[PDB]
Symmetry: D2
Subunit: 358 residues, 4 copies
């Protein structure tokens, strides 16, 4: 009793290969209303639908040097149904620039009773109809975020299992309706744990995930994974090289991610714009065999400069846009192993972008 | 700890209230699409008022029903509806000693990759919903998963995913002061015999209790709502009420911890009278049974009422006495004291899919 | 495809009901050579086969007031094939006194790699042939001991799973060959954990166990369980009532042990002879509904007085024997809720019998 | 940590030695009861010396074989036997660049309650055994589990128990410096087609790698020994070497982490020459294959040798050249360079049960 036909598997797989084609990566512009608000407050802008439309507009209409950098773009539900100044729907703006459109489908984390503050994610109710709809409207891929935490007795067995299940239900429903699912089991960087602990935990999580995906009969060639890199915790006193991070990371992946997975688009998760690209580059230079695309799905770490440059003010449109492009180019070269820093890393692009997920 | 001693005690208290001796539950929680087929069968139109009137028929029946019905399961719409005399429907229920329950699942959905098997959806925002339902009078809740015996079903994915959504559902409920009725339904569809049902029943309950343990569920503040253990609907071999009873009671002895407060069976398709008869054979089994074994019946309390009502206001009393006799027969069946039918009380209620 | 026939299930079940018939319990005389040696050294006796035969002989031939107290007796492989002074095989000595003979089949704990000193147990190789043999030779039940520890990150998921599996393989093999298995998942009392932690851990373990037994198609009515009571740890500073121990214990069992289990024969595990009987009594007096026999499978806690009285010396035969009988009578009344202490608890019967399982 | 950086490196080193480019393994580890049926087929008696002589035939073949054979799997008895010239058999092996392996399982045992399915036993005292075997020259080890495709098989219990004994086995091995070859055999018995094998193959490997993760196995210091993915022996539909290849290589892309150092296929019943041909189609698949794909063959390196030997000392050279050509053909097959049979090299080696 198969889930998918031969044609359904070719579609899903083509979609997944176009998004991580060599040199390309993912821009994640999928912050919810309550989330993007904390971004605009920090540059003194009212969080209006129109400033939301305007800022998204700024990223999706940057010049055509980004086109070979940006293979996909993840939008929030609001944005998917907004239009640029010239009247073209944002879906079509990204399509016309060579990027697959994607849509955030989860509905946020909820607490797991009887745990030390662990969560699962909700969002499956009516998901198959939402996906068919999003597909009509231009979305060819989906995103769902699960959050785990390294700490005192966490991630617990219950939270590794439950998170991995639900990422399996979500992916089954997307594939049925035409959409590549991005499976994001993010392990947070909060805490003082060292690098090898984040490797261990990540290896335990991604194995639970790819068992669950197998149990749910998910078509891996039409999926992508967006995990965290293996890093020491935010508060870890000890210091680790960028090549130590590339070794821990590639090794965690080689021990768990089956080669049929079409690619791995890392989240930046609190890394500065520059640390994200240096560590992504270091990973793509690791000489160990890596049979999947290793690129980016960066939200904060592609937009920090652009957002401080824009400041809220219409007349910085082109100066914001350019900081973003400069980043899309950095990370396209990083996702190929060709990124050598200019030595001039902007203050905004050196600022830690971490926020305790308390 | 998932819960405090005070929260745990409030759940043990409710669960015990529902399934007190000689009491069972009225499962009146038909969705608006499935109460449509019960009304279509009696020529009545599917209108908000005709559902309101039918539900008021069942809730306002006479006080003989009060010791029979510890809990009434209601659909959303009916929770916010009122009797003719102005009272909201939950206050009618409480006024007669019934605890009010709320069905909170959002139905089945296909599971890709299986032969026609499903999950159950409904978890999104369930915490806020329960919080509110508890403020509006509801103290227990209901969630149905649905498995079917076929050549390759219930599969491992099916059993494991439905036990996991049940447990999630139950965990949310209990954090909001709501007693969860856990409902893993094995449907009677197909030609399997009794042993097969028994094997599947055991296999599904073992998976259910394990999942509930993993999710830290307080079992004293749960009810279990399982199918009886019966042959398939299309089975040619036949079996006595004593065989059904033995096998149902065996299967639950081997899988259900004594801490679970009550077992409230679904009727599943059985005639009003076979459901009562079987429930009585179960309770008369000499084996030891550490939990209440009672009824949470929809069709097997409602089929004669609906026919006797006919959509006609003048039939209210007649149709209300039909409910009250099946409520009274099950009150005795769930104490082993029912020693009895009529055509409507002997008609198969089996529907497919 | 069933594992057992109707007759095979009646045999196994009858055997299991005869062993915990009201008022009866289990004497565990199944210490290995290396283990019983540490017992005899502590009364200054050479650990010879003949002193081993003699001491076992002392317990199995005590007067016939023990017969209604002792429903089964677990022997080690050596003992099963020894003979009393009058030439009668020990199996037959216990049979003639009304007790089922039982045999220890495990081969001791081994380390689980990558854990903090956790173990599983080994002993399955050739087990089905050993069981058929033991059955010919008089054994109607078997014992296998799994050990878990409460501590820093233990019992771990791996050790709960693996232990529970292997207890499932062992029980499948016993039933096939005619023998009731006693499933012993002992959680050690070592450590300073409080009572509610031992409840929690015990509830998690016994649920893993009875899932595994279900997965392996084990016939529960022809099984018994020998768990630890729920107690605070040995080093726990805090103090707990005997009724608090009976509440934690009965509650842990009601939440996990399906009613079809024929009985629960507690291990004494470091409790004094007297604490074991008071806590067993308190448990059988707990007014909560308990649908299984709640009796004893005591090794150390039936033999401490007898062994210090015997001292190694043939002429204390009858004085040793009597301390043991006095204990079998205590615990038969306890397993009925009828044990009220004499106030005169012997020093040997008040001595802690704990030994760090380091 | 299960292991130190130094222990891990010694395991990565051995695993890589075995499956170096153009090298595969000689699976010469027949138990004394199963080498009895290979000898009975050539009229030879089953005596300690006749097994010693046959094993010496295969081990002392000429140096052309040295670049083909990175590892030789031996049965206990043969590990302590000697060549005519006095050398112990492992030193013969090492002298020609072969790593010596030891089969350490104690066979299959029925799993109650299933349709004829088995586990594998052999864990008791395995740590001491390995410790000693490593002292006597062995650096890898072998353990075979056996699953069969049938209407209700491989069941969930079967898949889960055999993945768990494999992992235990592998954990013990690695604590003693021994590279474990993990062998989950899906037998070719039955009439299933290729898709079925593929589905089952994927399902079993996903369970294997999960179990290995749970038990903390260092995958760089393991080898995987899986069946190719082929139709059932009694399947009427037929399939090309390209289809077999695609499907085998797909199934392993979807389940085997790139960290596993090598995949050493079992022949499973295929003729000496079909096994070679298939291995070559696998390695020529243009898809990406992050691990070595090579051979650990018993019958598909030994069938022509045994026939040409006939039990007759004078046939030694003839029978040794038969081994050396299949060793040489597979050395090329596992590089995609085999472009070729004979009756004995084309005969089905399928046996039942």
């Amino acid at each position: 009793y198969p889930a998918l036909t031969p044609e359904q598997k070719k579609e899903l797989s083509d979609i997944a290969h176009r998004i991580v084609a060599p040199g390309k990566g993912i821009l994640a512009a999928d912050e919810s209303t309550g989330s993007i608000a904390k971004r605009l407050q920090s540059i003194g802008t009212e969080n209006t639908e129109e400033n939301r439309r305007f800022y998204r507009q700024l990223l999706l209409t940057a010049d055509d040097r980004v086109n070979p950098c940006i293979g996909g773009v993840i939008l929030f539900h609001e944005t998917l149904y907004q239009k640029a100044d010239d009247g073209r729907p944002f879906p079509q703006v990204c399509k016309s620039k060579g990027g697959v459109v994607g849509i955030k489908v989860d509905k946020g984390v909820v607490p797991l009773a009887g745990t030390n503050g662990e969560t699962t994610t909700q969002g499956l109710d009516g998901l198959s109809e939402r996906c068919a709809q999003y597909k009509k409207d231009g979305a060819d891929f989906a995103k769902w975020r699960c959050v785990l935490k390294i700490g005192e007795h966490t991630p617990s067995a219950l939270a590794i299992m439950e998170n991995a299940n639900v990422l399996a239900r979500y992916a089954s429903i997307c594939q049925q309706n035409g959409i590549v699912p991005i499976v994001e089991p993010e392990i947070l960087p909060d805490g003082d744990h060292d690098l090898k602990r984040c490797q261990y935990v990540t290896e335990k999580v991604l194995a639970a995930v790819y068992k669950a995906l197998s149990d749910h009969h998910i078509y891996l060639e039409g999926t992508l994974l967006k995990p965290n890199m293996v890093t020491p915790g935010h508060a870890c006193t000890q210091k680790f090289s960028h090549e130590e991070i590339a070794m821990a990371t590639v090794t965690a992946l080689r021990r768990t991610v089956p080669p049929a997975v079409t690619g791995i688009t890392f989240l930046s998760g609190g890394q500065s714009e520059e640390e994200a690209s240096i560590n992504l580059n270091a990973i793509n230079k690791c000489p160990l065999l890596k049979p999947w695309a290793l690129t980016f799905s960066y939200g904060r770490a592609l937009q920090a400069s652009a957002l401080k440059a824009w400041g809220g003010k219409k007349e910085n449109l082109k100066a914001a846009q350019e900081e973003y492009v400069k980043r899309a180019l950095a990370n396209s070269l990083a996702c190929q192993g060709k990124y050598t820093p200019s030595g001039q890393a902007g203050a905004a692009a050196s600022e830690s972008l971490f926020v305790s997920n308390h």
